[PDB]
Amino acid sequence: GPDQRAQKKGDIILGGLFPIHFGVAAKDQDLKSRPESVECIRYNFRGFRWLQAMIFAIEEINSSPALLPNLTLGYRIFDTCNTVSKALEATLSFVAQNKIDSLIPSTIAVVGATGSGVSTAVANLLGLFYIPQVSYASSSRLLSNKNQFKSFLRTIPNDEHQATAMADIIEYFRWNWVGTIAADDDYGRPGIEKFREEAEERDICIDFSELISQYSDEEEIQHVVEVIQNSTAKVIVVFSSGPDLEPLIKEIVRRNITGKIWLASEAWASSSLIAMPQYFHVVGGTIGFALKAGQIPGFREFLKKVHPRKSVHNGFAKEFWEETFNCHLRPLCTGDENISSVETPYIDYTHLRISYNVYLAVYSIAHALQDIYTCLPGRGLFTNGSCADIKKVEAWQVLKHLRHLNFTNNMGEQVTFDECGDLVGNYSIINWHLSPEDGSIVFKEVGYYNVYAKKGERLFINEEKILWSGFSREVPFSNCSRDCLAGTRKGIIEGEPTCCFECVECPDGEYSDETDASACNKCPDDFWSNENHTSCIAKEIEFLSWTEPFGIALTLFAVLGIFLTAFVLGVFIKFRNTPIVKATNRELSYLLLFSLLCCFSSSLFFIGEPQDWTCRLRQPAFGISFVLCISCILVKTNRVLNLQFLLVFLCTFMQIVICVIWLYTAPPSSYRNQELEDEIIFITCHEGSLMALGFLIGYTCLLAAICFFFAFKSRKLPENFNEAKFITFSMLIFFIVWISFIPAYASTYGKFVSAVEVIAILAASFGLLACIFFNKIYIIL
Amino acid sequence: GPDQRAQKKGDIILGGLFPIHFGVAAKDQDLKSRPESVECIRYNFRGFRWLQAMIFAIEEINSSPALLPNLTLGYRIFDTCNTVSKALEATLSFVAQNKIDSLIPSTIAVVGATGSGVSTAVANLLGLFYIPQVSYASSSRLLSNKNQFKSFLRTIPNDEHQATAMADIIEYFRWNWVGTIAADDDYGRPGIEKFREEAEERDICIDFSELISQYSDEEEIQHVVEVIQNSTAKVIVVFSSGPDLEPLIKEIVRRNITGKIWLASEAWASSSLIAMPQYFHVVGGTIGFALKAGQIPGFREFLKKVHPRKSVHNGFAKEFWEETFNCHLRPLCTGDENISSVETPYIDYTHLRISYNVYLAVYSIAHALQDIYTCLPGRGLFTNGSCADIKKVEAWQVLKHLRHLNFTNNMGEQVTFDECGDLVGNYSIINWHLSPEDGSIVFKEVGYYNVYAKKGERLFINEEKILWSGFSREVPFSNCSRDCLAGTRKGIIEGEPTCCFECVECPDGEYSDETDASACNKCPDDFWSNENHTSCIAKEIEFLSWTEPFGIALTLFAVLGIFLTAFVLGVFIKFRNTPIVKATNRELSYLLLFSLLCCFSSSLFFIGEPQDWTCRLRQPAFGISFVLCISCILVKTNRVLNLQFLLVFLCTFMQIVICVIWLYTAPPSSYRNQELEDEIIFITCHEGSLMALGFLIGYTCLLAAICFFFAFKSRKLPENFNEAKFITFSMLIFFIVWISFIPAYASTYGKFVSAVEVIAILAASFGLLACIFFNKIYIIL
Ligand SMILES: *[C@@H]1O[C@H](CO)[C@@H](O[C@@H]2O[C@H](CO)[C@@H](O)[C@H](O)[C@H]2NC(C)=O)[C@H](O)[C@H]1NC(C)=O
Ligand SMILES: *[C@@H]1O[C@H](CO)[C@@H](O[C@@H]2O[C@H](CO)[C@@H](O)[C@H](O)[C@H]2NC(C)=O)[C@H](O)[C@H]1NC(C)=O
Ligand SMILES: *[C@@H]1O[C@H](CO)[C@@H](O[C@@H]2O[C@H](CO)[C@@H](O)[C@H](O)[C@H]2NC(C)=O)[C@H](O)[C@H]1NC(C)=O
Ligand SMILES: *[C@@H]1O[C@H](CO)[C@@H](O[C@@H]2O[C@H](CO)[C@@H](O)[C@H](O)[C@H]2NC(C)=O)[C@H](O)[C@H]1NC(C)=O
Ligand SMILES: CC(C)CCC[C@@H](C)[C@H]1CC[C@H]2[C@@H]3CC=C4C[C@@H](O)CC[C@]4(C)[C@H]3CC[C@]12C
Ligand SMILES: CC(C)CCC[C@@H](C)[C@H]1CC[C@H]2[C@@H]3CC=C4C[C@@H](O)CC[C@]4(C)[C@H]3CC[C@]12C
Ligand SMILES: CC(C)CCC[C@@H](C)[C@H]1CC[C@H]2[C@@H]3CC=C4C[C@@H](O)CC[C@]4(C)[C@H]3CC[C@]12C
Ligand SMILES: CC(C)CCC[C@@H](C)[C@H]1CC[C@H]2[C@@H]3CC=C4C[C@@H](O)CC[C@]4(C)[C@H]3CC[C@]12C
Ligand SMILES: CC(C)CCC[C@@H](C)[C@H]1CC[C@H]2[C@@H]3CC=C4C[C@@H](O)CC[C@]4(C)[C@H]3CC[C@]12C
Ligand SMILES: CC(C)CCC[C@@H](C)[C@H]1CC[C@H]2[C@@H]3CC=C4C[C@@H](O)CC[C@]4(C)[C@H]3CC[C@]12C
Ligand SMILES: CC(C)CCC[C@@H](C)[C@H]1CC[C@H]2[C@@H]3CC=C4C[C@@H](O)CC[C@]4(C)[C@H]3CC[C@]12C
Ligand SMILES: COc1cccc([C@@H](C)NCCCc2ccccc2Cl)c1
Ligand SMILES: COc1cccc([C@@H](C)NCCCc2ccccc2Cl)c1
Ligand SMILES: O=C(O)[C@@H]1Cc2c([nH]c3ccccc23)CN1
Ligand SMILES: O=C(O)[C@@H]1Cc2c([nH]c3ccccc23)CN1
Ligand SMILES: *[C@@H]1O[C@H](CO)[C@@H](O)[C@H](O)[C@H]1NC(C)=O
Ligand SMILES: *[C@@H]1O[C@H](CO)[C@@H](O)[C@H](O)[C@H]1NC(C)=O
Ligand SMILES: *[C@@H]1O[C@H](CO)[C@@H](O)[C@H](O)[C@H]1NC(C)=O
Ligand SMILES: *[C@@H]1O[C@H](CO)[C@@H](O)[C@H](O)[C@H]1NC(C)=O
Ligand SMILES: *[C@@H]1O[C@H](CO)[C@@H](O)[C@H](O)[C@H]1NC(C)=O
Ligand SMILES: *[C@@H]1O[C@H](CO)[C@@H](O)[C@H](O)[C@H]1NC(C)=O
């Protein structure tokens, strides 16, 4: 394989795949000359630390007598440069003896790779030969498919939980308008698809979805930047690694776009390529995910013991030395430099997360080998309970024992792989802060995601520790439309997702008391809308009331009429012996005064809240009383022109028969009219039979016409102090009053119709009383 | 490599990857023993025809002297079984000489593979060594990435156009509620993502998105089936191959789900695994995509010449013979059977689409080799214009010449590969019909998709040829919500996409004239909504018009009053010498009659449409005329009790000063009241100065009260035929009329206030005229 390698000899050989370089020289091969091996350029100190973690774990296993006694573990580790081609050359180097026996030391297991696409490409070849491959950083769900990848296992948790956690985070901060960026590889696309599913099931709308790569052209990056700028959303979920996101972040920094709230996947939430101070105005305040940190005692000293000459087995130490001190072995370096003197990710780390994954992968392979070594003859996992010979062990046997692995960590936790080869683990939630002393970016832990917890309780966040955009304490607004107040209702904007709405105020008569009201709820039948439609208020019920001032005035006038009638009646009764009261029919005078009292009592009926009996006894009472009084006047005129009682009885009986008829057929009834005024309910009365009202007033006015005619025929005659002209005057007053209020009765449907009726009754009764009796009162004085 | 192979020797060797089997055995090893090579189960006759197409193209090239003279093409073709593992074993067989020179005949180029995931896995290894790989059926966009796949080219069009075409088809048939199913591989996921993008830009809502596979468990298939059933959407877009869709179709057939409209991607739109008659109730009427058919003259005869013994180079002919006739060489077969006797996809084909792609790939490699062979010494593609030695040709040189390929087909078309190695091509659109004679499924061409055409013109469909569900001629309904009629407006349903809406009728005063009205438009102030709210009609304007019957009646009474006043005036002028008219002031009588004429003319003012001058000259005219009348009556009474003209002038001048004052300060104006009734606009008049109106009526009624008082003081006195009582009567009639209509003026704001005012004016004028002059007329007779 490649010349640059870390090789050690042993009984069992472990393969190693690490990204010692971030990527390869970006150039299009001309194919004019024979193509040579591409050279990867940017040194990755963190990847070299991962390689050192693998070597340290192997050395610790070799030193420990408890684990794999009398057996020596060796390694063959190559640099992938985050590239499929280099990893495939290394894998072809691994499977040389398998290829010879299908178409150099034998490779029992392989550790790696980092990238999910690289791991998929390597896993195809490795599972072709059933060589177990335990990856430390590849987290794509596509690798969980065991039909495709038979020998692939993971010490890193699967990516589905991370997308669910991002959806939970967006829900927690109450956002529904977000953008998505994904790396165009096996890491970005499945994760972003899972996030899209989880966001749509949480009613979260995604404005844009874009794909990026480290090989994206200038036009693609410009298009993505334009899409980001053109959007209102400021929360962008990014599923990518450092190298695949670096060009986009660089272009955003050049254009200097600030205000975006970045949600970071684990691959770049701790990336040194993205977390640099000069990008902090763009990427500051980023909220991202980190793996659970682990402890590897003695690892730091082993890292500090690195040396070009002393590390003879590790061939990558040469370039690490040359890149750390910028020397060559460009100034020549003696080799006596100090690692602690230079600040690189190699030593400048706080938590071991992927390095712990490498350590766990190596120890998992070692524990599988130990389970093979300690297998009791009749209790094996293979056919008939047989056990593999550790001296002549085969890769498929180690894979079989890895599928059944259960071992305790140095941290006292149980490591197991499921049917998909996944190792579930918690997440920590970090926020990108700026250091005051140094100015570098500090990853402050602000929360966690508990995968073991049930749905809805997995997320915990300390929002007080969060600095939005790196400096702000207020949660930013990332909704498409403002949640407008009550009294309004949401409405569709064509061609736009449901999260974006225009809210129109409620229609008159409909109320909305809730923010984000889908529709304006209607008020009930007896209620109406508020002034701003933020509530519902009872409809005002209106009629002619007793306590209201005008009803009081009408009642006082009715009582005054009753008092005057009683006064005249008392004057007549106490002084019945005088010739003046003897001239007129004093019995008929008493009956007429009683009729006037009944008339005023009937006038009292119209005032007040309408009721069934009240509307049933308003027209009939006045009709009876006024027919009776006109009949008494009629018999007085006929005397002027026993039997008089018979005539008044005949008239009152005809009128009361009419009344009984139309009260038996169709009683008047109280009804709550609601169509005249929307806000106001009019309590009024249905007559029931309108032709009955015609008959009633026709009879009253016909008896009136007869009385007026007979009084006119004898107007000039002086008798009983010429009462004929007074009768004529009272009756013409009756006709003036009742004709004059026809405009009043016409179309004035409200609380004032009862007032008009009361005033008409009072006027007619007062005119009759005055004309009949006030002349006699003047005579008596 | 694998023992079962098709091998021929030659100077230049072409690799071959074909799916002779549909898959592998479902033997998921428990790793009890050493895992053996997996056995392939279901024979694929169409894949064997593709392999025969490759062999036929190679043989035709060898026979043709024009193409590659004195050079013999050989092949090494293996069976992939649509599996990554076996394809990778074959690819490792291809790259043996490369692996020997990086860590058996040399492979110059490889044809294949079919599946996109298989092609990706093979292309990683092949591009590691820059061995050109021309695929005939893998259409994933992921393979267009030349950073990852350096040596990969395609004779099949890329899948982006097909997803765009499906979006265009959904738009054409007016659907917005569709479901999506995709194979969980490199073919299904990118295509379904492209379709999701193209549908979201076209306002198409996707109810569900599911993933399937040939290895999907029972629970996954049941979940997908329940998702399909639970959905209202009837159109389902499927990006999958036959084997990956077969379990889902089988389960849907078991449950007998009918009514769905399947949109088929090219991989399964012509699949024999899905297009079987016993599934026609479920998959009948499917609309799918096919590639351009090609012509390979002599191919059918070569296919019919297949034989186990005679085809010594083709090792796959043995199992083809055994599967075709169900024999062994299970009854023994002599080998003298006839291919045409048995109906298999091998010969029972109508159009060569993938076989033509295989043929084109072989001729593309051959033409690249020919371009190498005919290279002029100083005009090469390589360094310094050098040309490759065809005798010692290398794979990377052939790849370089393939990247620059221009050659003419046997059909007379130009074959070229772009920078991504893609060959663009048209699509045909087919519909799954049922044959009447045979009962098999017939793929009827119903349209095409022209990739060369501009956007919006690429799709052509003959809907008359389409049988929906296999039997129906009516386009099915696949919208989430009914597009309800006009008069209604759409409204949001919470938690649901914009395509699903509840439409509420428009509010009163608002109209929607369009289907799918986003909001109800309020039409202008003079308009009010229709009863259906489909439009809005003009607001009715209400006033007291001349043509109205009641306005006509009022005009007739006014004209009658004018006629009566003129008659009295004529009687007075013609007979001025009589003693009766000499007794009264004849000049004052003429003035009073003229004032009555002015009063009737003022009564005529209120009738008609209000106008600024009309509302300005309504109250003043009547006020001045009636005060002049009362002043003449006043001087007549004062005579009853020169200077009379002075008194009438004083009174009329006081009132005219009041009038000039309040028409100078604030004149009355015509206004269109729109608040009393929503549907109707009342045209009425603002007085302007209400206190000035108080002054006007106060002065008129005060001059009245003075006249009434003075006439009452001299009521009994007989003079001028005792005109005093008649004056008192006219004046009391004035007071009765004007007091009586106070209820009428109160709150009766409409077209009837002018009517009431006209009636009051007519009544007062008639009373005055009658009382003053009709007694004199009676005396004159
Ligand atoms: C942004 O929009 C979301 C969704 O409408 C709002 O979240 C809602 O908040 C209210 C009150 O807290 C809850 O009753 C709803 O259930 C939430 N809807 C969800 C979770 O879908 C959020 O408040 C908005 N943020 C703003 C306007 O700043
Ligand atoms: C994953 O995270 C959860 C929550 O942080 C851990 O549960 C906590 O465990 C500690 C002790 O280890 C308790 O004091 C807390 O009360 C627990 N919190 C809960 C249950 O909400 C859990 O142990 C973590 N798992 C791993 C494997 O680290
Ligand atoms: C289903 O809904 C779609 C909405 O997209 C309707 O298609 C629209 O029809 C109107 C007709 O006036 C066109 O103006 C729009 O341009 C169409 N929208 C498109 C094509 O996206 C379709 O008519 C509905 N089908 C029904 C109700 O059967
Ligand atoms: C793709 O399809 C279009 C339309 O079917 C083809 O254009 C047609 O070409 C024929 C001649 O070959 C003309 O008679 C038609 O009028 C054309 N139709 C158009 C322009 O709409 C086009 O040639 C096809 N491209 C191929 C086969 O490569
Ligand atoms: C009550 C409303 C609806 C109808 C009005 C009825 C009026 C117009 C009718 C009914 C009674 C009638 C009067 C009955 C008696 C007399 C006396 C007679 O010597 C002259 C006619 C005269 C003066 C009539 C005039 C018209 C009259 C007053
Ligand atoms: C509309 C109603 C309520 C109010 C009308 C009041 C009327 C009906 C009353 C009030 C004053 C009354 C007048 C008082 C004086 C006279 C003069 C006398 O020689 C004949 C009766 C006559 C003419 C009365 C007729 C009726 C009269 C005008
Ligand atoms: C002077 C002559 C006409 C006799 C007087 C009769 C008067 C008192 C009565 C008889 C008929 C009545 C009219 C009948 C119709 C209406 C329409 C109504 O919506 C308003 C009142 C109004 C306009 C009335 C006004 C007064 C009226 C004209
Ligand atoms: C109709 C409503 C508005 C008012 C009713 C009061 C009127 C009609 C009543 C109350 C007092 C009555 C007056 C009492 C005294 C006299 C004096 C007598 O020599 C002529 C009748 C006359 C003048 C009466 C006319 C009618 C009269 C004025
Ligand atoms: C229409 C507005 C002005 C209200 C009407 C006011 C009425 C109630 C006033 C104004 C003119 C007044 C009359 C003026 C003249 C007389 C004659 C006198 O010997 C007795 C009082 C009497 C009969 C007054 C009665 C009340 C009266 C009619
Ligand atoms: C009843 C006798 C003693 C007096 C008669 C006066 C009459 C003709 C006049 C004077 C004041 C007038 C009232 C003034 C106020 C209103 C309120 C209005 O919305 C309806 C008409 C109504 C109810 C009028 C009814 C008739 C009325 C009472
Ligand atoms: C104008 C509306 C109110 C209709 C009322 C008509 C009144 C105002 C007019 C019309 C005809 C007139 C009558 C004509 C004839 C006479 C006879 C005379 O000896 C007494 C006056 C008297 C009785 C007049 C009274 C007023 C009168 C009745
Ligand atoms: C005239 O003498 C009367 C005899 C009986 C009753 C009454 C009064 C109490 N009712 C006025 C009924 C009101 C009215 C008038 C005209 C048209 C419709 C309507 Cl609803 C008067
Ligand atoms: C009474 O003698 C008059 C002198 C001048 C004018 C008039 C008439 C033409 N105007 C009625 C004005 C109507 C009215 C009455 C009371 C309250 C409000 C309103 Cl709006 C009469
Ligand atoms: O699967 C993948 O592609 C990513 C690669 C990756 C992860 N975390 C990282 C940290 C540093 C460098 C690389 C990574 C998570 N899985
Ligand atoms: O890339 C892929 O996976 C599919 C495989 C495929 C296509 N068309 C076919 C016809 C028959 C059999 C298989 C196929 C289109 N591309
Ligand atoms: C974004 O808006 C700018 C300004 O008009 C425009 O130039 C650019 O094309 C837009 N991009 C997209 C993706 O709409
Ligand atoms: C970038 O934008 C910020 C505004 O947030 C501004 O303070 C800063 O000066 C800008 N930097 C450059 C180089 O323009
Ligand atoms: C591993 O062993 C522990 C006991 O030390 C046990 O609790 C745990 O369940 C085991 N793991 C599995 C997967 O059985
Ligand atoms: C379909 O709907 C039924 C009824 O609500 C429910 O029980 C079932 O779980 C649903 N299935 C799916 C796949 O959503
Ligand atoms: C399957 O469905 C079709 C169409 O609805 C119907 O004709 C047929 O009888 C059904 N068969 C069974 C077994 O339900
Ligand atoms: C291929 O050659 C033809 C002429 O034979 C020419 O028209 C066409 O443009 C060429 N294609 C390319 C890609 O150069």
Ligand SMILES: [Ca+2]
């Ligand atoms: Ca790696």
Ligand SMILES: [Ca+2]
């Ligand atoms: Ca050891």
Ligand SMILES: [Ca+2]
């Ligand atoms: Ca990184």
Ligand SMILES: [Ca+2]
């Ligand atoms: Ca949209």
Ligand SMILES: [Ca+2]
């Ligand atoms: Ca294949």
Ligand SMILES: [Ca+2]
């Ligand atoms: Ca030849």
Ligand SMILES: [Ca+2]
């Ligand atoms: Ca198929």
Ligand SMILES: [Ca+2]
């Ligand atoms: Ca939803």
